[PDB]
Amino acid sequence: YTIHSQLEHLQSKYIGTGHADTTKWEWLVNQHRDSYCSYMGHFDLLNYFAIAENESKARVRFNLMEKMLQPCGPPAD
Amino acid sequence: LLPRLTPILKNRHEKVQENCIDLVGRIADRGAEYVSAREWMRICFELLELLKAHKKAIRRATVNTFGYIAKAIGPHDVLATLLNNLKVQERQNRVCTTVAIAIVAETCSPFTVLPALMNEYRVPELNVQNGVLKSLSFLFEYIGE
Amino acid sequence: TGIFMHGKIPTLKISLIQIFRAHLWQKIHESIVMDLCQVFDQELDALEIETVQKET
Amino acid sequence: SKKKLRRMNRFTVAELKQLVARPDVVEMHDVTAQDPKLLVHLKATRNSVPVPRHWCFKRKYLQGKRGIEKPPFELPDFIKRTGIQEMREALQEKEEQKTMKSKMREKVRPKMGKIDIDYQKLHDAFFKWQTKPKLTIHGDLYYEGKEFETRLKEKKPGDLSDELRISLGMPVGPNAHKVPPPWLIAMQRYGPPPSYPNLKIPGLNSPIPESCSFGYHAGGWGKPPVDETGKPLYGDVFGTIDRTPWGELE
Amino acid sequence: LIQQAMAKIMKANPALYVLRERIRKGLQLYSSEPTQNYGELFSNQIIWFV
Amino acid sequence: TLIPGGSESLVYTTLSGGIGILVPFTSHEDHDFFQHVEMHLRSEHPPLCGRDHLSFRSYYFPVKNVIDGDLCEQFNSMEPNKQKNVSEELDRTPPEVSKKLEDIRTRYAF
Amino acid sequence: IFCRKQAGVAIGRLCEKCDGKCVICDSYVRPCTLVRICDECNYGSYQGRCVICGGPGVSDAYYCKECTIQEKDRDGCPKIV
Ligand SMILES: [Zn+2]
Ligand SMILES: [Zn+2]
Ligand SMILES: [Zn+2]
Numbered sequence: 175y176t177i178h179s180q181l182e183h184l185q186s187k188y189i190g191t192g193h194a195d196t197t198k199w200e201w202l203v204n205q206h207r208d209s210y211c212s213y214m215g216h217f218d219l220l221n222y223f224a225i226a227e228n229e230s231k232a233r234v235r236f237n238l239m240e241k242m243l244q245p246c247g248p249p250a251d
Numbered sequence: 252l253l254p255r256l257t258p259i260l261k262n263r264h265e266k267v268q269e270n271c272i273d274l275v276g277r278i279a280d281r282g283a284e285y286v287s288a289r290e291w292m293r294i295c296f297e298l299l300e301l302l303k304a305h306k307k308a309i310r311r312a313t314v315n316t317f318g319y320i321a322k323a324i325g326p327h328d329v330l331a332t333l334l335n336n337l338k339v340q341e342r343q344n345r346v347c348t349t350v351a352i353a354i355v356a357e358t359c360s361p362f363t364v365l366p367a368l369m370n371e372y373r374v375p376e377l378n379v380q381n382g383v384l385k386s387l388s389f390l391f392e393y394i395g396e
Numbered sequence: 397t398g399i400f401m402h403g404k405i406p407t408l409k410i411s412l413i414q415i416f417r418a419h420l421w422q423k424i425h426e427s428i429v430m431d432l433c434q435v436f437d438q439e440l441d442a443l444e445i446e447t448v449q450k451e452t
Numbered sequence: 453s454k455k456k457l458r459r460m461n462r463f464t465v466a467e468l469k470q471l472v473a474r475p476d477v478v479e480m481h482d483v484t485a486q487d488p489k490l491l492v493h494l495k496a497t498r499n500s501v502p503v504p505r506h507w508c509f510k511r512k513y514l515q516g517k518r519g520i521e522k523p524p525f526e527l528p529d530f531i532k533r534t535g536i537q538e539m540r541e542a543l544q545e546k547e548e549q550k551t552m553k554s555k556m557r558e559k560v561r562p563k564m565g566k567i568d569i570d571y572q573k574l575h576d577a578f579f580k581w582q583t584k585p586k587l588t589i590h591g592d593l594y595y596e597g598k599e600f601e602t603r604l605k606e607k608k609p610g611d612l613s614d615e616l617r618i619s620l621g622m623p624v625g626p627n628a629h630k631v632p633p634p635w636l637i638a639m640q641r642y643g644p645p646p647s648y649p650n651l652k653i654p655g656l657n658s659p660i661p662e663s664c665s666f667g668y669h670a671g672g673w674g675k676p677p678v679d680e681t682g683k684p685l686y687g688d689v690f691g692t693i694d695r696t697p698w699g700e701l702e
Numbered sequence: 703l704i705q706q707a708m709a710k711i712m713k714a715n716p717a718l719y720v721l722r723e724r725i726r727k728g729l730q731l732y733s734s735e736p737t738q739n740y741g742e743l744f745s746n747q748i749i750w751f752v
Numbered sequence: 753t754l755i756p757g758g759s760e761s762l763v764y765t766t767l768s769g770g771i772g773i774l775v776p777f778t779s780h781e782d783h784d785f786f787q788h789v790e791m792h793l794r795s796e797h798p799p800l801c802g803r804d805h806l807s808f809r810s811y812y813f814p815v816k817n818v819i820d821g822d823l824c825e826q827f828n829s830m831e832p833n834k835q836k837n838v839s840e841e842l843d844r845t846p847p848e849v850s851k852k853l854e855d856i857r858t859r860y861a862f
Numbered sequence: 863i864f865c866r867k868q869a870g871v872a873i874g875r876l877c878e879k880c881d882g883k884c885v886i887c888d889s890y891v892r893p894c895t896l897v898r899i900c901d902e903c904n905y906g907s908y909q910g911r912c913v914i915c916g917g918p919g920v921s922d923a924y925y926c927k928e929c930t931i932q933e934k935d936r937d938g939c940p941k942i943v
Binding site for chain 4: 778779
């Protein structure tokens with residue numbers, strides 16, 4: 175259970191993990207944020223979207239980082 | 252030379268033991284045919300209780316030479332003498348014989364040893380069934396691909 | 397076995413029989429001769445021995 | 453209390469099954485989910501793999517494999533015919549017979565090189581006759597009591613067994629085709645069963661199985677059931693590219 | 703060679719051991735024997751150092 | 753197939769200006785060869801940028817039955833010391849390796 | 863119990879009782895990579911100690927090749943404090 179002190183330290187360590195009660199909302203929103211961080215990181219899906227819509231890389235990443243805030247609806251209750 | 256060296260392998264000291272087993276390993280690698288199978292068998296039986304030295308360099312050297320002897324003589328007699336050691340208790344010489352089994356299998360291809368290991372998985376004792384499982388562990392790690 | 401009796405001492409014969417049961421006389425012969433063969437098997441080098449033959 | 457309010461907050465298994473879009477999944481484990489709409493959407497996703505059986509059970513994982521007698525292990529063929537197995541069996545029987553005394557003696561005046569290891573026999577087993585065992589694809593967890601399970605949902609008519617043939621009076625083997633079973637007889641006589649009207653009987657509503665025989669004795673096909681005008685009872689009781697792989701190593 | 707072989711096979715061989723043990727169990731004989739020294743050493747008992 | 757009489761191939765053309773081919777193997781000798789070539793190359797000549805090669809090529813689902821010609825073809829630009837070490841593990845000469853490297857592109861592509 | 867406050871460039875060391883085993887896997891073999899610890903479990907009287915025994919730093923804590931295949935060696939100072 176000191177293992178648990180370390181393990182909810184691990185929950186505090188890695189944003190996106192889970193535990194047996196985790197809610198569909200936390201799960202899917204964390205995966206959605208991660209999806210955004212990687213669309214930004216990988217230099218080429220950025221071209222994919224930039225080219226799919228008719229936007230430009232500054233436009234693209236600005237949208238993405240705005241969306242990063244409430245990507246999957248408002249919260250659960 | 253080597254007949255003179257064999258009574259030194261009993262010198263119970265890390266530095267002289269290190270260098271002696273190095274020299275005998277060179278010789279058994281290159282000289283191989285000059286020494287007789289029976290000599291190598293007696294030396295196998297003596298290695299079986301270096302696996303309890305308090306220093307880990309000794310034990311790693313011991314495992315390596317089990318490998319070299321499996322190359323010079325065939326694998327089957329050395330493998331038979333290793334299973335009977337697995338029957339011992341006290342864990343740190345069981346675990347080092349299980350390393351040695353992995354090493355013999357790595358040098359002389361694993362089909363030579365896998366049937367005997369698997370078949371020994373049927374003797375109803377604990378320490379030995381676990382010896383078989385741990386040896387396959389090391390073997391797949393050594394074999395890798 | 398290779399024991400000679402000169403009569404009938406039944407109690408003694410029973411003890412001696414129960415001692416050498418299960419062909420132990422020949423087993424002793426086999427173990428001794430095997431050990432000797434092994435000693436030769438090893439010291440072939442010094443002994444100038446090309447071959448050692450254990451007659452089945 | 454809080455538990456009582458959320459227990460009442462929970463719904464009926466019919467509540468669920470009617471709500472849900474895919475009703476196959478619903479079980480009371482889901483009806484007991486703190487988020488059953490999720491739980492059921494998940495369990496109805498593609499390709500996902502359900503929890504093992506045995507979380508409910510009181511017995512641990514294979515303590516049920518305990519009680520019945522269990523055989524030990526059967527080697528692979530290519531290792532039985534590689535002559536290291538037989539080597540090991542022989543050495544085993546030797547050293548189980550020998551007396552405590554002899555084991556100590558072999559350790560001492562050793563039988564050095566009793567049997568030299570055989571090569572190219574081994575290396576050909578492991579590198580020339582090694583073959584794919586039977587594997588089970590994604591999902592089919594092993595559970596205890598799997599051997600018992602009855603096996604069903606073969607509504608097919610052609611499904612016959614050899615003990616079935618023997619203890620029904622019909623033939624086993626290559627003659628399971630050319631043998632119309634004793635139920636195809638009354639299939640021809642008054643029809644095949646009216647819940648397997650989507651089943652055709654071989655030699656009775658289907659054509660001759662390979663090299664069948666027409667005749668009315670024991671061992672034939674008899675009158676393929678037909679109308680008086682000639683049309684059979686159903687069906688036809690008489691009977692009237694480049695698959696090369698691209699990347700491959702021979 | 704054989705002097706060595708004899709003086710050690712007479713001692714070591716397990717067959718002879720099964721013999722000697724059946725002999726003993728037929729007699730029901732037992733040994734009660736189990737298993738500085740120089741306080742015992744300078745005694746009237748002579749003891750040599752080689 | 754690209755060059756005349758060249759054995760078949762898979763051309764793949766990416767979204768960043770990359771074009772390449774995946775080419776079968778005809779002999780476990782070829783196969784085992786490059787297999788060992790790169791199995792050593794990963795160990796003694798890892799990528800620059802921190803990564804592991806096995807894990808980069810098994811990013812999403814693990815690798816299965818593809819050898820990294822672009823790691824193999826790096827033996828050329830390696831250093832004589834390591835060129836030795838590895839080709840000696842193969843106990844072929846750096847000539848043997850490098851020619852067996854070049855020719856496999858020779859019979860498939862350019 | 864673990865420190866796990868993240869890694870650094872300071873090597874760890876082993877007492878001679880603890881000589882030879884990996885830090886977690888408890889192996890005795892095929893060590894591949896060296897161990898690194900945190901500044902906080904690096905300072906002071908804790909300089910050069912046994913991550914396990916607490917004894918004096920003499921031999922180098924290492925990482926069993928399994929631990930490096932599964933990258934359980936990329937978490938930092940695993941000191942049982
Ligand atoms: Zn470890
Ligand atoms: Zn620390
Ligand atoms: Zn320590």
